[PDB]
Amino acid sequence: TRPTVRPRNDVAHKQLSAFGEYVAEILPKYVQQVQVSCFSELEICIHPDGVIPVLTFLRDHSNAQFKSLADLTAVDIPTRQNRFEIVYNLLSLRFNSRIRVKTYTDELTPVESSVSVYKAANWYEREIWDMFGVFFANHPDLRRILTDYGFEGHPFRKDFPLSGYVELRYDDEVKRVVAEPVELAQEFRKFDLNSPWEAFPAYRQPPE
Amino acid sequence: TQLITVDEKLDITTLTGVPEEHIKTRKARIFVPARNNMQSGVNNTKKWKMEFDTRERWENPLMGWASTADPLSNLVLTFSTKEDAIAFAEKNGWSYDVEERKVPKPKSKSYGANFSWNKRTRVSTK
Amino acid sequence: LGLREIRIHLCQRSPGSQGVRDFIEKRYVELKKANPDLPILIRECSDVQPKLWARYAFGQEKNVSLNNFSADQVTRALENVL
Amino acid sequence: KVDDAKVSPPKRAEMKTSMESLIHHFKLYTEGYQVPPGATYTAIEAPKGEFGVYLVSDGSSRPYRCKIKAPGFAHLAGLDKMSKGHMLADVVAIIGTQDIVFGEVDR
Amino acid sequence: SNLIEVFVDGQSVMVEPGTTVLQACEKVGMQIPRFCYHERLSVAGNCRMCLVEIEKAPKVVAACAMPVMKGWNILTNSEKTKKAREGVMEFLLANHPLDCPICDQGGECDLQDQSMMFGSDRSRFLEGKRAVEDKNIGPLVKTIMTRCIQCTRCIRFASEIAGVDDLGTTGRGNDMQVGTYIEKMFMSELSGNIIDICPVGALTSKPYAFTARPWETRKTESIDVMDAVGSNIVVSTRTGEVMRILPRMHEDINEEWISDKTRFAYDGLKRQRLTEPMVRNEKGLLTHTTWEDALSRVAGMLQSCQGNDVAAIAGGLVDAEALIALKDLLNRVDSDTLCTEEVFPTAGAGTDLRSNYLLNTTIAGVEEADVVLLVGTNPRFEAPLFNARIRKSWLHNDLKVALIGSPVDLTYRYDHLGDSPKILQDIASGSHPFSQVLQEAKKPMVVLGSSALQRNDGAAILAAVSNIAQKIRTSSGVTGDWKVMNILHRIASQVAALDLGYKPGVEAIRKNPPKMLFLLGADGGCVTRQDLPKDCFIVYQGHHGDVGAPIADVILPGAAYTEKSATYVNTEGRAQQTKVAVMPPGLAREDWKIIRALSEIAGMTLPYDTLDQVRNRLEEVSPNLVRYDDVEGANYFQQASELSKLVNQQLLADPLVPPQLTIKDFYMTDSISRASQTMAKCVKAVTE
Amino acid sequence: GVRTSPTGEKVTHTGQVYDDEDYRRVRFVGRQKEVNENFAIDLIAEQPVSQVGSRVISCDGGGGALGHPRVYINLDKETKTGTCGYCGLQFRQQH
Amino acid sequence: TSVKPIFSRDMNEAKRRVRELYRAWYREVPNTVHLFQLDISVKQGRDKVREMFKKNAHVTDPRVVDLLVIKGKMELEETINVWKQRTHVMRFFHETEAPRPKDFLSKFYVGHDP
Amino acid sequence: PTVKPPTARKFIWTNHKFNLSGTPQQYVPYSTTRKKIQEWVPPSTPYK
Numbered sequence A: 001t002r003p004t005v006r007p008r009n010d011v012a013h014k015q016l017s018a019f020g021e022y023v024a025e026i027l028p029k030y031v032q033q034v035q036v037s038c039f040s041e042l043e044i045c046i047h048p049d050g051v052i053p054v055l056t057f058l059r060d061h062s063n064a065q066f067k068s069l070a071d072l073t074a075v076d077i078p079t080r081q082n083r084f085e086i087v088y089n090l091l092s093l094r095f096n097s098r099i100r101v102k103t104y105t106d107e108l109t110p111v112e113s114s115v116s117v118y119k120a121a122n123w124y125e126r127e128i129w130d131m132f133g134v135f136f137a138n139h140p141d142l143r144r145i146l147t148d149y150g151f152e153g154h155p156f157r158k159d160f161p162l163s164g165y166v167e168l169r170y171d172d173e174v175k176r177v178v179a180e181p182v183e184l185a186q187e188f189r190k191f192d193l194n195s196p197w198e199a200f201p202a203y204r205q206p207p208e
Numbered sequence B: 001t002q003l004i005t006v007d008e009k010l011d012i013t014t015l016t017g018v019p020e021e022h023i024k025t026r027k028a029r030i031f032v033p034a035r036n037n038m039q040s041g042v043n044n045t046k047k048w049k050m051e052f053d054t055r056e057r058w059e060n061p062l063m064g065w066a067s068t069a070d071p072l073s074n075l076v077l078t079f080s081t082k083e084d085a086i087a088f089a090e091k092n093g094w095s096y097d098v099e100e101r102k103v104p105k106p107k108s109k110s111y112g113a114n115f116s117w118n119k120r121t122r123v124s125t126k
Numbered sequence C: 001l002g003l004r005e006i007r008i009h010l011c012q013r014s015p016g017s018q019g020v021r022d023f024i025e026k027r028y029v030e031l032k033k034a035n036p037d038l039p040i041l042i043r044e045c046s047d048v049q050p051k052l053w054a055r056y057a058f059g060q061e062k063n064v065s066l067n068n069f070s071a072d073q074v075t076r077a078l079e080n081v082l
Numbered sequence D: 001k002v003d004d005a006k007v008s009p010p011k012r013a014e015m016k017t018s019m020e021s022l023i024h025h026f027k028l029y030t031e032g033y034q035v036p037p038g039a040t041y042t043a044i045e046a047p048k049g050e051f052g053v054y055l056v057s058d059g060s061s062r063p064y065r066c067k068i069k070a071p072g073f074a075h076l077a078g079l080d081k082m083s084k085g086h087m088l089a090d091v092v093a094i095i096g097t098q099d100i101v102f103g104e105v106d107r
Numbered sequence E: 001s002n003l004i005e006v007f008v009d010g011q012s013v014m015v016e017p018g019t020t021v022l023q024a025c026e027k028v029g030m031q032i033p034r035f036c037y038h039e040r041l042s043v044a045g046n047c048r049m050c051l052v053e054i055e056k057a058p059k060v061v062a063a064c065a066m067p068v069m070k071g072w073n074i075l076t077n078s079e080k081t082k083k084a085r086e087g088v089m090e091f092l093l094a095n096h097p098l099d100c101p102i103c104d105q106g107g108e109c110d111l112q113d114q115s116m117m118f119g120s121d122r123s124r125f126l127e128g129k130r131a132v133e134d135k136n137i138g139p140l141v142k143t144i145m146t147r148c149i150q151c152t153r154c155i156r157f158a159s160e161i162a163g164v165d166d167l168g169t170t171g172r173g174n175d176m177q178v179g180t181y182i183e184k185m186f187m188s189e190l191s192g193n194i195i196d197i198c199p200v201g202a203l204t205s206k207p208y209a210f211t212a213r214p215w216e217t218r219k220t221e222s223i224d225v226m227d228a229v230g231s232n233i234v235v236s237t238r239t240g241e242v243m244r245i246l247p248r249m250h251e252d253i254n255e256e257w258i259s260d261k262t263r264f265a266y267d268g269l270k271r272q273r274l275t276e277p278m279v280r281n282e283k284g285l286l287t288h289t290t291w292e293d294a295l296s297r298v299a300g301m302l303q304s305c306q307g308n309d310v311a312a313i314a315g316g317l318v319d320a321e322a323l324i325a326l327k328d329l330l331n332r333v334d335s336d337t338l339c340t341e342e343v344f345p346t347a348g349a350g351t352d353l354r355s356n357y358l359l360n361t362t363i364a365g366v367e368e369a370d371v372v373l374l375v376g377t378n379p380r381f382e383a384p385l386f387n388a389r390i391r392k393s394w395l396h397n398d399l400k401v402a403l404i405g406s407p408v409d410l411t412y413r414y415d416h417l418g419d420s421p422k423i424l425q426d427i428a429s430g431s432h433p434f435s436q437v438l439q440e441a442k443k444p445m446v447v448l449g450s451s452a453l454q455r456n457d458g459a460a461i462l463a464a465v466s467n468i469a470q471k472i473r474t475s476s477g478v479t480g481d482w483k484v485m486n487i488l489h490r491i492a493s494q495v496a497a498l499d500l501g502y503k504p505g506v507e508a509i510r511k512n513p514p515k516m517l518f519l520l521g522a523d524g525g526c527v528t529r530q531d532l533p534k535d536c537f538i539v540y541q542g543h544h545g546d547v548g549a550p551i552a553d554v555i556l557p558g559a560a561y562t563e564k565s566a567t568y569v570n571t572e573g574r575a576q577q578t579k580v581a582v583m584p585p586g587l588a589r590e591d592w593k594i595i596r597a598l599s600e601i602a603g604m605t606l607p608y609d610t611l612d613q614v615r616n617r618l619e620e621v622s623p624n625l626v627r628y629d630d631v632e633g634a635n636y637f638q639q640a641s642e643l644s645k646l647v648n649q650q651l652l653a654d655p656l657v658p659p660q661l662t663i664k665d666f667y668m669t670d671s672i673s674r675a676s677q678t679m680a681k682c683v684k685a686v687t688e
Numbered sequence F: 001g002v003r004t005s006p007t008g009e010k011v012t013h014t015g016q017v018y019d020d021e022d023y024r025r026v027r028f029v030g031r032q033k034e035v036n037e038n039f040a041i042d043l044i045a046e047q048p049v050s051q052v053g054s055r056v057i058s059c060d061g062g063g064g065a066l067g068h069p070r071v072y073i074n075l076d077k078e079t080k081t082g083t084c085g086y087c088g089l090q091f092r093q094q095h
Numbered sequence G: 001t002s003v004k005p006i007f008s009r010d011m012n013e014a015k016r017r018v019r020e021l022y023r024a025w026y027r028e029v030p031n032t033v034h035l036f037q038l039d040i041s042v043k044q045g046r047d048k049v050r051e052m053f054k055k056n057a058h059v060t061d062p063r064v065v066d067l068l069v070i071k072g073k074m075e076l077e078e079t080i081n082v083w084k085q086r087t088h089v090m091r092f093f094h095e096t097e098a099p100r101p102k103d104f105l106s107k108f109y110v111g112h113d114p
Numbered sequence H: 001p002t003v004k005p006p007t008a009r010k011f012i013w014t015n016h017k018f019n020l021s022g023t024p025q026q027y028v029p030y031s032t033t034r035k036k037i038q039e040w041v042p043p044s045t046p047y048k
């Protein structure tokens, strides 16, 4: 098991286990899952009524600094009632640790809009509004970043297809660029690559 | 808070941006995919795939490709139960045909009956 | 002019299906002996309202509902149609 | 490369004069290797900053959702505080002084 | 209550006694990898991949053929389980050539998938690798026996289902050829199913051979035609023009098999199709035009022609939507002679009272029968999967099978009662050594073939079969709702057209010669211009017509069975619908779409627009045609039997014989199989 | 070396020459149909049928890692020579 | 199902916000058709604005009407600013469709189109 | 290449037709694929 297998450490695993238990002890109101993966990064799975209390606690409290904010995304999962998962990805400075606050929401719910406690989340929140479709209440500006103005449909969903519905071309009738329904020149052949035979037995869900 | 109290269906079809043609024209077949019969493995089961009907794929007259006027045709939505499939199909607006999941029948095979005395289960070749 | 078809649509567990099964087990060979050239046809699916449809005269399809009618009441309404 | 034919493709001599190497080449290029289900976020010190990638992978041969933390995006977020009390040639100098390529800022 | 505890990987589960270890591991959801176990064939222990470790045991046991003792604990992911699997995999890839590029199962092999997910990475075996000379099993099956792994699953399949006994192991050691010793073309029914059985790319398809690759062709659910059973199929289509027809699995009917004609009958689906509406040109020829000319011509002629003189022969392979639209339109005109091509008798309440024209029991329900008597049929060539079901029943439990009408090549040793309707008269009388077996039987079935029902004795034969049915109904205790009597058909659209209430036979046209007739897929010599007045006005509607298409007047290019959303009924009343996998080439509209547009262009209308409204009128004509993939049997055997007791016909004592007597007459007797070339190749291979 | 239809346009190694009722004859106006004039069928029928004194023989393709992977082919039929699927060049046996 | 709102409590505030937004779109058109140098009279622009408001008329849920008010207010801010160009405002119209008909017969002459 | 000109290979061009865009002699694309579905042929004879 020594060559070409990534050696895991248990000190960081035990410390992140103890710290996740500590966080869920001191915030009993909003905490549902506290998971540590095999490669020792903490994940805290959260009801959407405590985004401001959890992040105001985690930016401060002097035993977990977590000054820096990274990726925010809300991965567009069907099959559930609450679809979207918002992932605040908090990085400390004094500690060298990484935690992922994963709160859940559906299509029509305002989460508490972390722009007041992380100024980096301004364009992150505006981008997630434009691409996914999750409205954020008590927020200064929501406009469309990374999309065209005349374009809509919230394209990063699984429901929006790969090619869009509109397609631009210049024409000389009205002497400008117009939008037309898509007429592709090639199919975009989708391949049926997901072969059977269960490549991981450790991740078998229990059947009905 | 929790001010809104209502028990009604969702109407996201006016928000998701897809036009009325592809709302009320196509149809969603909801099905467990069949086992790829040349292989023998039911790992391709357990996932309720939602797919749409296929439409015209003519020939591109310069190369011989498959051009299409179909944005929604190359979708697949893998789910885990029939109820959430029906809920998503009724929520997002379009029509739906829910097919059936057909389990393999639990049989009883026996090598000792493959080597019987008076019965007609005598394989005569092994 | 006259009739073309009479169609009966039934089910297997209902008091209306009980009444029309009483009719169709007791008085069906009589009716087919009476009119030879009327293809009066019976259908049973799983569970449906027991409809009775008379198709004639350029697509006039008159409709009666045989919901919880007894066999005398079924025969009387069928003779009212025919 | 690694000592595992199921992830890296085998070299071409063993591919030609070996059966299992041909099978692993063929499946490893058509289906690809599978990835166990899970989510990770790694980030390395690119010259612009903490270039981050957050993979979410259902156990399959395709990733489920990837997302990219761009240091240029995070730097361009603070353009107001970097150009509040200065003039417009200094605004051009501020846009230049952060290594912003405007293809990474888009994600 | 017959329960045994097995701890699969520690987790407990109750399992009935007698079952294998692999069925228990599939009861908890695990898959033990396997090569020679198959869930439709007998269990042999040849492949040895299936090994699994039992706790507190020195040896590693085979999960394919091990019964369950009390209280197991099974390790499917232990040390020596994995060592045994990697060992057996390292043995299997030794004498197996480097053909994975040129192979045909390259996307769908099992050596590849299991050598990924269970086997080793680096190989060994520097020198060796035997090579075996390939055979020629048939002109329909390409055979490279170098790739064979000697799993012995083609042999068990042929011997236990096809009943042919031609495939054999020959030799010892490494030299174990699997094939025919005597250069004999293995030509029988279900010969096409052997390419799905062979898990490696040895027995591959001949017309499919080097034309596709399975990660590109997308899969589509669909329903068969040309067989009354309607096996489920999946069309793996390429890019708007298809590839192949694999069998989609249904537990009741047509389990994991398919008919040979179904499997190899799409070459004719792409060989002579109609793409343009065609009109007879006054020089005498048959030119083509746009939709406006042909539909305006048919509309003006149909407006100027009413009365009892309009006919609609709707034969061959047509829909339920097409039948609803045609019957609704021709109801709107004045009246009807709507007919089918094949002749079913309607004297004792034919079309009505559902039980006397379909197959009342389930096709899967014949397994619990005990005495089956076939009358006037050769079931090997008429729905051959029904014959495979009969042989599976006769093989596993006991069946007294008796045949009346023809000494034919059934593969399961029927008893033979002769060729005379007077034999059936005397069975109804009660003087045989076999009617005693009927009245001492438990669950009896009398299966009538419709091929001997086409002749001029049909109502008499049906009345005698109803005599047998009422005789067993009386002279026994009613054990339950078992059903002695049933008939079977050849074409599914006859079942659909008799559900919707058409006249069977062409006698209504023989009585009243019409001035206008619609041939919705009239295949054979149903009617000609010689059996009809001068002003014919034949409107043919369909795809690749070969008989009637020169004779007809207005040619309309209807769609195909893989090319439209249809509604089909099998021989037992189950409703199964096709799916649009490929749009029809050319102009080539659907059938009911043409008919409703013809109604619009003529001076009338049909009161519906789209396909959901069509299916709503389909339910408003007959209600079982919306409960898809579901069955409900009829009743009223006493009422049907007493309605059969009015008209006496003389039973002609001529020797009744089915036309489907041999392989050539199975292969040629359809339009789609007639148009192809693969059927012609195997026809000349069998006849030569 | 190549065949040519009576429409005046060259066929290819695949018989795909156009009819009298197409417009791709008009898309070829002024610009040549750059067809490979070197067919692949006739450069194998000119090859010598090799005769190797063993029974089951190897095929590499002329070079380690320059050529197709090894195929071992059998030469036991008397009237049909064995044929490599990769190469295309035949073999025989001598005894 | 005690759901959190967006802005409103029932359909009353929904109707109030949508009539406020329609008043804004009514007083916002002639400035833009003078500014971006379009080719369409003011009355046709107002008729298609009220057509866009009549398109979503069967919507009943209050959160959905609140979110449509938010969409319309965002696009009205982007049109009262000079951010959107002539292309997008003409893209709201439909002059280059050659529109497909809706009769069954002309859908039959250009078929495979349910 | 005056030392060792390799791999002679009789099919190799002895002409080397150079870069030819904007000439009368250049490449045009076309489908190298034969007949797709083989449309029907009407009979030559008339009736009556």
Ligand code: SF4
Residues within 6 Å of the ligand: E096, E097, E098, E099, E100, E103, E104, E105, E106, E107, E109, E110, E111, E112, E147, E199, E200, E201, E202
């Ligand atoms: S049968 Fe399987 S292992 Fe053998 S050549 Fe074909 S794909 Fe490869």
Ligand code: SF4
Residues within 6 Å of the ligand: E147, E148, E149, E150, E151, E152, E153, E154, E155, E178, E197, E198, E199, E200, E202, E203
């Ligand atoms: S030919 Fe195929 S099915 Fe028969 S023994 Fe060989 S590998 Fe098995």
Ligand code: FES
Residues within 6 Å of the ligand: E034, E035, E036, E037, E044, E045, E046, E047, E048, E049, E050, E051, E062, E063, E064, E065
């Ligand atoms: S499956 Fe048990 S030996 Fe092949």
Ligand SMILES: [Zn+2]
Residues within 6 Å of the ligand: F059, F060, F061, F068, F071, F084, F085, F086, F087, F088
């Ligand atoms: Zn070779």
